[PDB]
Design an enzyme around this catalytic site. Structure first.
Site, PDB file in Angstrom:
ATOM      1  N   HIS A 170      -8.821 -24.353 -38.616  1.00 28.03           N
ATOM      2  CA  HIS A 170      -7.717 -24.119 -39.542  1.00 28.03           C
ATOM      3  C   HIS A 170      -7.140 -22.708 -39.467  1.00 28.03           C
ATOM      4  O   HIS A 170      -6.099 -22.465 -40.078  1.00 28.03           O
ATOM      5  CB  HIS A 170      -8.151 -24.398 -40.989  1.00 28.03           C
ATOM      6  CG  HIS A 170      -8.493 -25.826 -41.235  1.00 28.03           C
ATOM      7  ND1 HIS A 170      -7.612 -26.850 -40.969  1.00 28.03           N
ATOM      8  CD2 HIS A 170      -9.613 -26.404 -41.717  1.00 28.03           C
ATOM      9  CE1 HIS A 170      -8.182 -28.003 -41.263  1.00 28.03           C
ATOM     10  NE2 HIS A 170      -9.395 -27.761 -41.721  1.00 28.03           N
ATOM     11  N   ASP A 181     -12.291 -33.553 -35.487  1.00 30.60           N
ATOM     12  CA  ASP A 181     -12.589 -33.329 -36.904  1.00 30.60           C
ATOM     13  C   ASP A 181     -11.636 -34.148 -37.775  1.00 30.60           C
ATOM     14  O   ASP A 181     -10.509 -34.443 -37.382  1.00 30.60           O
ATOM     15  CB  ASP A 181     -12.464 -31.819 -37.189  1.00 30.60           C
ATOM     16  CG  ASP A 181     -12.741 -31.439 -38.636  1.00 30.60           C
ATOM     17  OD1 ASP A 181     -11.883 -31.690 -39.502  1.00 30.60           O
ATOM     18  OD2 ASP A 181     -13.794 -30.831 -38.917  1.00 30.60           O
ATOM     19  N   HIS A 237      -9.931 -33.410 -40.270  1.00 29.94           N
ATOM     20  CA  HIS A 237      -8.746 -32.690 -40.699  1.00 29.94           C
ATOM     21  C   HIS A 237      -7.922 -32.238 -39.504  1.00 29.94           C
ATOM     22  O   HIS A 237      -8.441 -32.043 -38.401  1.00 29.94           O
ATOM     23  CB  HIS A 237      -9.124 -31.472 -41.541  1.00 29.94           C
ATOM     24  CG  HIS A 237     -10.023 -31.790 -42.696  1.00 29.94           C
ATOM     25  ND1 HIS A 237     -11.398 -31.805 -42.590  1.00 29.94           N
ATOM     26  CD2 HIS A 237      -9.739 -32.115 -43.979  1.00 29.94           C
ATOM     27  CE1 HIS A 237     -11.922 -32.108 -43.766  1.00 29.94           C
ATOM     28  NE2 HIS A 237     -10.935 -32.309 -44.622  1.00 29.94           N
ATOM     29  N   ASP A 265     -17.025 -34.886 -40.137  1.00 30.54           N
ATOM     30  CA  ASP A 265     -16.535 -35.287 -41.446  1.00 30.54           C
ATOM     31  C   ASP A 265     -15.706 -36.569 -41.394  1.00 30.54           C
ATOM     32  O   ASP A 265     -15.185 -36.997 -42.427  1.00 30.54           O
ATOM     33  CB  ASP A 265     -15.745 -34.147 -42.113  1.00 30.54           C
ATOM     34  CG  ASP A 265     -14.816 -33.408 -41.164  1.00 30.54           C
ATOM     35  OD1 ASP A 265     -14.649 -33.817 -39.999  1.00 30.54           O
ATOM     36  OD2 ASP A 265     -14.234 -32.397 -41.613  1.00 30.54           O
TER      37      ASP A 265
HETATM   38  C1  LIG Z   1     -13.562 -35.114 -53.671  1.00 29.35           C
HETATM   39  N1  LIG Z   1     -13.765 -33.709 -53.363  1.00 29.35           N
HETATM   40  C2  LIG Z   1     -14.889 -33.068 -54.059  1.00 29.35           C
HETATM   41  C3  LIG Z   1     -12.977 -32.974 -52.434  1.00 29.35           C
HETATM   42  C4  LIG Z   1     -11.927 -33.550 -51.686  1.00 29.35           C
HETATM   43  C5  LIG Z   1     -11.189 -32.782 -50.770  1.00 29.35           C
HETATM   44  C6  LIG Z   1     -11.460 -31.416 -50.553  1.00 29.35           C
HETATM   45  C7  LIG Z   1     -10.656 -30.598 -49.559  1.00 29.35           C
HETATM   46  O1  LIG Z   1      -9.877 -31.131 -48.793  1.00 29.35           O
HETATM   47  N2  LIG Z   1     -10.819 -29.192 -49.515  1.00 29.35           N
HETATM   48  C8  LIG Z   1     -10.099 -28.274 -48.586  1.00 29.35           C
HETATM   49  C9  LIG Z   1     -10.878 -28.063 -47.262  1.00 29.35           C
HETATM   50  C10 LIG Z   1     -10.688 -29.139 -46.195  1.00 29.35           C
HETATM   51  C11 LIG Z   1     -11.115 -28.678 -44.810  1.00 29.35           C
HETATM   52  C12 LIG Z   1     -12.563 -28.245 -44.772  1.00 29.35           C
HETATM   53  C13 LIG Z   1     -12.992 -27.654 -43.451  1.00 29.35           C
HETATM   54  C14 LIG Z   1     -12.986 -28.696 -42.368  1.00 29.35           C
HETATM   55  O2  LIG Z   1     -13.865 -29.513 -42.173  1.00 29.35           O
HETATM   56  N3  LIG Z   1     -11.865 -28.683 -41.555  1.00 29.35           N
HETATM   57  O3  LIG Z   1     -11.842 -29.597 -40.587  1.00 29.35           O
HETATM   58  C15 LIG Z   1     -12.500 -30.874 -51.291  1.00 29.35           C
HETATM   59  C16 LIG Z   1     -13.229 -31.619 -52.198  1.00 29.35           C
HETATM   60  K   LIG Z   2      -8.652 -33.374 -36.255  1.00 30.35           K
HETATM   61 ZN   LIG Z   3     -12.872 -31.071 -41.125  1.00 32.02          ZN
END
Ligand SMILES: CN(C)c1ccc(C(=O)NCCCCCCC(=O)NO)cc1
Ligand SMILES: [K+]
Ligand SMILES: [Zn+2]
Ligand SMILES: CN(C)c1ccc(C(=O)NCCCCCCC(=O)NO)cc1
Ligand SMILES: [K+]
Ligand SMILES: [K+]
Ligand SMILES: [K+]
Ligand SMILES: [Mg+2]
Ligand SMILES: [Mg+2]
Ligand SMILES: [Mg+2]
Ligand SMILES: [Zn+2]
Lengths: 346, 345
Positions: free
Chosen positions: A162, A198, A200, A287
């Site tokens: 990111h 990943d 995201h 994830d």
């Molecule tokens: C239901 N719950 C507790 C949640 C749902 C979504 C997030 C989130 O997207 N947070 C922003 C970070 C997303 C990317 C994290 C790093 C990653 O794995 N990037 O690929 C958080 C909590």
């Molecule tokens: K990805």
């Molecule tokens: Zn991710």
């Protein structure tokens, strides 16, 4: 069958923040030291291959991707935050809203917002050193592949994909995958592909290479209309300038299983084959897992063996950089399954 | 002299428990006792009649704010709770540099798209209170339009940081901008908005930035050093037909009234040159020497001098309450402006 080397930092807790802004509360962070501990324990337990610590490369190869101002800010941010009297961890409170100027201010709060895209990625003592070590882990894996290994696993923590040239967020600070890809290029590999599996979108990697045709960037991810990073990752972002048609986003909706996700994987592999790169960087998150606490795909642990097998069929020198994956119970099984599948396990 | 004050008891519906500050969730600075303390000083000094607002509906709000943004504020809390979040509604992600200014579907994405910061929690009643606060400003504007020399809109929540479609800095609807646009919609050819709150009125600046019919002026702490950080610099003079119709006057830490009032005199000369038909004063008393989040050094007596100087402009004048966070003195300071305007020294 085959063996793959893993690079890791022994100081899993060098980054050790205790707060993450989530749903309006300050909770314990999802991106925990035990993520790396658990993956390393499974690498050893499965005898994947040799494990090694990182070589120090310094900030030179980091600055081939990130701006000087940004790299300086990450080194001093915590010190300046503490000196300004703040009592929590360093979290942005204000940012460049729509209609405001992209203008670097003097105050630490202003710089924190200028250099970030989210408030869930706290900074504290050790974060700078942890980001540096994670980039060295990526660069050590890249060196191993450049000097003859078919593949190597960079057990990066914190993750990277990111981070833009001068923006942190999504638990990321230095874009390990982009730093590895640029190192391949600097060492004379004409073309490099970065494939982001990943859950995201790898917005940082997209942005870094967006106007370039020598690095192809591809990401599979959940629909940004619905999930982070929300404001990049849509399928109409295909590049700019000379980079037109060298970025590809493939989005999926909630509950997408491997049977559907792997169709997007095949489209990505076909784009990679046409590009004919000289090296491959895989930004690997698990994830996509059916029990991941912040994501909504439905891959099973066994699917990661199939993912690794398909990536090996691309036939390229391959660096894997660890990105996300937040169900710690399964993170080791899931991540090492990709490497074992790459090495021939079914 | 007498001056009427408009006040809505519905401001109490805005009562959040958390504010992100220095990496912690703290008790908010913009709390209901601010409005109640000013109101009690209005009564204690018998400043004038105290009125409740009329309901003007969303039409006058939508003269300045986008329909999508007004709709978002009405449903935000319910969507947040329905999505399963357990805290107050606080943005976590936004359009970072290099990303697309594109409205997403998810509540977190929409919260970030419509915001400039994370220190302004939304909870139940915020919508109702923001609506009542805009009606407070519009009732004060109506009082002045129908014959009063001046009126005090005792707005809470404040408004001057709110853009057409961005909330933040404790602000949701830009009450001063809404009052200014109401003057324009009622046939006042030119309107000036003078922002004496410690912070830059970035929302007011943004709303009228490409227009020459509304002159916007703000005195404030240097945004290099303080919120809102990314607007408020002196080189921002307008765009298009609005160029030369915006004026920022910036001051450093520890600035006293002897220096601040030189900037005020520059602002008044600019207003005199503009020759407006009405004046809206975005009034904060966070310029006060004991304000907990600001760094100017005005004394309580300086607010009497401020009000006197504003009356000398000789304009129909609407005051909208913005900031000021020393609750001990907030009533004395704000009412001192009104009393100085009406002739007290
Ligand atoms: C239901 N719950 C507790 C949640 C749902 C979504 C997030 C989130 O997207 N947070 C922003 C970070 C997303 C990317 C994290 C790093 C990653 O794995 N990037 O690929 C958080 C909590
Ligand atoms: K990805
Ligand atoms: Zn991710
Ligand atoms: C020393 N300390 C405890 C603080 C210092 C600064 C802030 C702040 O600027 N917060 C952002 C809000 C600024 C605008 C507030 C609303 C206002 O008065 N606008 O005029 C907060 C706390
Ligand atoms: K590219
Ligand atoms: K101001
Ligand atoms: K203007
Ligand atoms: Mg600050
Ligand atoms: Mg489980
Ligand atoms: Mg969400
Ligand atoms: Zn203020």
């Amino acid at each position: 069958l085959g063996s793959m080397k893993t690079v890791f930092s022994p100081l899993h807790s060098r980054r050790h923040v205790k707060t993450e802004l989530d749903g309006g509360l300050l909770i314990e962070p999802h991106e925990k030291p035990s993520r790396a501990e658990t993956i390393l324990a499974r690498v050893k337990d499965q005898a994947l291959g040799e494990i090694l610590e990182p070589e120090e490369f310094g900030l030179g190869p980091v600055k081939r991707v990130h701006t000087a101002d940004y790299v300086s800010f990450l080194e001093t941010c915590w010190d300046e935050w503490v000196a300004a009297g703040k009592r929590g961890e360093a979290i942005p409170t204000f940012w460049v809203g729509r209609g405001m100027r992209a203008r670097l201010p003097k105050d630490i709060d202003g710089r924190l917002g200028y250099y970030s895209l989210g408030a869930d990625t706290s900074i504290s003592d050790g974060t700078w050193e942890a980001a540096r070590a994670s980039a060295n882990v990526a660069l050590t894996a890249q060196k191993l592949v450049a000097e003859g290994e078919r593949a190597a696993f960079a057990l990066c923590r914190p993750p990277g994909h990111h981070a833009h040239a001068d923006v942190f967020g999504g638990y990321c600070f230095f874009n390990n995958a982009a730093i590895a890809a640029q190192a391949f290029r600097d060492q004379g590999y004409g073309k490099v592909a970065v494939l982001d599996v990943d859950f995201h979108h790898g917005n940082g990697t997209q942005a870094i290479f967006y106007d370039r045709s020598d690095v192809l960037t591809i990401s599979l991810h959940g629909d940004p209309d619905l999930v982070f990073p929300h404001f990049l990752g849509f399928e109409d972002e295909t590049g700019e300038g000379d980079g037109e048609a060298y970025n590809l986003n493939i989005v999926f909706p909630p509950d997408t299983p491997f049977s559907i996700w792997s169709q997007g994987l095949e489209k990505a592999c076909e784009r990679i084959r046409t590009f004919a790169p000289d090296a491959l960087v895989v930004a690997l998150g698990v994830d996509t897992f059916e029990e991941d606490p912040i994501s909504f795909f439905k891959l099973t642990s066994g699917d990661y063996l199939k993912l690794g097998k398909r990536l090996e069929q691309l036939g390229l020198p391959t660096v894997f950089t660890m990105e996300g994956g937040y169900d710690v119970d399964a993170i080791g099984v899931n991540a090492v399954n990709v490497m074992q599948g790459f090495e021939g396990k079914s």
